[PDB]
Design an enzyme around this catalytic site. Structure first.
Site, PDB file in Angstrom:
ATOM      1  N   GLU A 120       0.857  -1.365  -0.059  1.00 53.73           N
ATOM      2  CA  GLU A 120       0.164  -0.029   0.140  1.00 53.73           C
ATOM      3  C   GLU A 120       0.669   1.091  -0.083  1.00 53.73           C
ATOM      4  OE1 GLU A 120      -2.855  -0.063  -0.977  1.00 53.73           O
ATOM      5  OE2 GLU A 120      -3.883  -1.822  -0.298  1.00 53.73           O
ATOM      6  N   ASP A 206      -0.904  -3.332  -9.746  1.00 54.43           N
ATOM      7  CA  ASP A 206      -1.283  -4.961  -9.170  1.00 54.43           C
ATOM      8  C   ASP A 206      -1.260  -5.721 -10.507  1.00 54.43           C
ATOM      9  OD1 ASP A 206      -1.388  -3.199  -7.290  1.00 54.43           O
ATOM     10  OD2 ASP A 206      -3.762  -3.391  -6.959  1.00 54.43           O
TER      11      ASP A 206
END
Ligand SMILES: OC[C@H]1O[C@H](O)[C@H](O)[C@@H](O)[C@@H]1O
Ligand SMILES: [Ca+2]
Length: 628
Positions: A120, A206
């Protein structure tokens, strides 16, 4: 112009098996298959531990495709904390282990990892020491990160050195463009072309983008297209042909979009319009560098339930540090998702949070039981932790003197693993990353917001003529001041005796006084209540117990009962509430309007069972909780 291409594959611990398989067939598998046919294409990939474990279990052959590609120089394994924890939010000693575990997996895959994908992208000037001790040489962060420091996009095309203590570490920036260009019609060829002549272009995002996201299922074209004068290499390869730009110090940031989610509701709303406004006036591009929102760590501020869960695992992590078997469990409880909420369900997805509480509990089931007083979540007041061989009850005197935690060592489930219904800034839909949806009337109809936190044994006073649908949604008229107000306590032989002297604030304020003598039992608990009203008055007294029924889609019910059972196979166990004086029971599903990729998430975060008793001057009864 140098080019570094890489992906980040992860699936949170506790995710549904089918969700896992999907991601696999949708992108994990296809990607690496198409990668195998372009021997010049080099990808910098990071697989999370929970995903690698699932793959190792259900699809072994895949791990061989990896050893193959690594062996033929097409992959560089990027590592991180094995269970995807936010490195900055877990103990210093746990990082070392977390990183080393994944660092060891990569080795068994055949690669000697030297880089770490910052989960993150939450960064704090202190991970330097940890990363260094873990033998890591470079971290991948966002270009944004460098902006919030003082640089300009123009000078963010090289890796830098950042330090803390006397140690340094190489930081690579993630171009915001690419993570929005790729995947979408090779235009990158242009941005890349327009990069001229060290200097790199780094793309890292991602992998779910490559096939799992909304209809994302271009690549084969992107691979040979990349493979001209564009020099594409792997991080490691770069940090041998060049040395970082120079030293620069980074601020506590994350990727741009975190700035909004991490803000408390109102500030999130305010921030969004401020960004919309700058954009409208076409001034956001020249000033963005000076526009920032919140920080990840403040989700512990935004979601109390997340903070409690986080502070409880911290206590346990320390108490279990040298206990290898217990320790493994506490490390799993550090999987980041489920602690916050941005675009993906996160803390709103029950099974993700049921998994954290499972591991926190398993990690501490065999420790030695001990009752203790202390400010657990850091709200300036002190909880009461009562614990025996079967349960751990955490009571909050300062808040209705209610049981805020009831973990079952036997089931490794937290009966109060529930969420209060809160307003999210994005609940406001106007105009009527960048997809949206309006709130359908079928939801609007049942969309309520709590003013009360949801615990076990919350004491209310309501009008004997009140309706369930009014209480259900929050249109009822709470008469007493005992839900969110403090209670005095005195440690009892096997629990805590609490009591408060509020009042039943109606036409006239009839000073009241509630007494609950809570004591753990070999199978749960038993609370003896006593409510004596100073002046006679016609009203209903109600005890509310919030259970974490998650797999049984429940609906509002009303009924007379002296006893009753809850059954949540795949959720909490099978429990039974036993009164010694029948009462009016009010049951209702706690629905939450959450966001996700697909769209709106109306999720049963639990179920409230509140027992109503009539009272005029005196009332007494006994609520018993029995685990079955
Ligand atoms: O959190 C939402 C997403 O934001 C950005 O797209 C990040 O690249 C991705 O890692 C993250 O999952
Ligand atoms: Ca406290």
């Amino acid at each position: 112009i140098n080019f570094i291409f890489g992906i980040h594959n992860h699936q949170p611990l506790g995710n549904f098996g089918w969700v896992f398989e999907e991601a696999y067939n949708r992108s994990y598998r296809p990607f690496m298959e198409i990668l195998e046919e372009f021997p010049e294409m080099k990808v910098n990939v990071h697989f999370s531990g929970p995903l690698l474990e699932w793959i190792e279990e259900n699809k072994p052959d895949y791990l061989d495709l990896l050893r193959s590609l690594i062996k033929r120089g097409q992959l560089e394994i990027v590592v991180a904390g094995f269970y995807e924890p936010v490195l900055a939010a877990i103990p210093k000693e746990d990082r070392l282990v977390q990183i080393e575990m994944l660092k060891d997996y990569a080795r068994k895959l055949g690669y000697d990892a030297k880089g770490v994908w910052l989960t993150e992208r939450v960064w704090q000037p202190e991970l330097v020491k940890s990363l260094r001790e873990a033998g890591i040489e470079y971290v991948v962060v966002d270009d944004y990160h460098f902006m919030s420091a003082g640089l300009s996009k123009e000078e963010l095309f090289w890796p830098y050195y950042t330090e803390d203590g006397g140690e340094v570490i190489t930081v690579f920036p993630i171009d915001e463009k690419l993570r929005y260009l790729i995947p979408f019609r090779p235009v990158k060829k242009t941005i890349e072309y327009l990069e001229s002549l060290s200097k790199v272009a780094v793309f890292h995002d991602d992998g779910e983008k490559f096939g799992v996201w909304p209809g994302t299922y271009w690549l084969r074209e992107f691979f040979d297209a990349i493979t001209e004068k564009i020099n594409l290499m792997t991080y490691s390869e770069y940090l041998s042909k060049f040395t970082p730009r120079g030293l620069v110090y980074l601020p506590i940031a994350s990727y741009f979009e975190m700035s909004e989610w991490s803000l408390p509701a109102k500030q999130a709303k305010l921030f969004v319009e401020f960004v919309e406004q700058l954009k409208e006036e076409g001034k956001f591009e020249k000033y963005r560098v000076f526009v920032r929102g919140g920080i990840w760590k403040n989700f512990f501020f935004k979601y109390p339930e997340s903070n409690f869960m986080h502070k409880r695992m911290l206590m346990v992590s320390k108490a279990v540090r040298d206990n290898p078997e217990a320790r493994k469990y506490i490390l799993k409880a550090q999987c980041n998702d489920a602690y916050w909420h941005g675009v993906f369900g996160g803390i709103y997805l029950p099974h993700l949070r049921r998994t954290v509480w499972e591991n926190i509990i398993k990690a501490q089931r065999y420790l030695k039981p001990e009752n203790k007083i202390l400010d657990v979540d850091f709200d300036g007041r002190a909880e009461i932790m009562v614990e025996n061989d079967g349960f751990i009850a955490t009571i909050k005197p300062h808040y209705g003197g209610s049981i805020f935690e009831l973990s079952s060592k036997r089931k490794a489930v937290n009966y109060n693993d529930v969420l209060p219904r809160r307003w999210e800034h994005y609940h406001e839909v106007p105009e009527a990353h960048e997809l949206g949806k309006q709130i359908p009337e079928e939801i609007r109809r049942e969309l309520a917001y709590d003013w009360q936190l949801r615990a076990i044994l919350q004491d209310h006073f309501i009008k004997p003529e009140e309706t369930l649908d009014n209480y259900r949604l929050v249109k009822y008229h709470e008469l007493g001041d005992f839900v969110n107000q403090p209670y005095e306590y005195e440690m009892i032989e096997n629990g805590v005796k609490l009591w408060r002297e509020g009042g039943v604030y109606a036409e006239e304020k009839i000073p009241a006084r509630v007494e609950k003598k809570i004591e753990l039992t070999e199978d749960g608990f038993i609370a003896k209540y006593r409510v004596l009203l100073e002046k006679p008055y016609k009203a209903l007294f109600g005890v509310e117990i919030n259970l974490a029924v998650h797999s049984v889609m429940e609906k509002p019910e009303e009924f007379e009962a002296k006893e009753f059972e809850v059954n949540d196979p795949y959720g909490i166990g099978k429990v039974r509430i036993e009164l010694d004086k029948a009462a009016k029971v009010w049951k209702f599903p706690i629905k939450t309007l959450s966001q996700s990729e697909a769209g709106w998430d109306f999720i049963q975060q639990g179920v409230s069972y509140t027992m109503l008793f009539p009272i005029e001057k005196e009332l007494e009864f006994t609520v018993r909780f029995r685990e079955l």
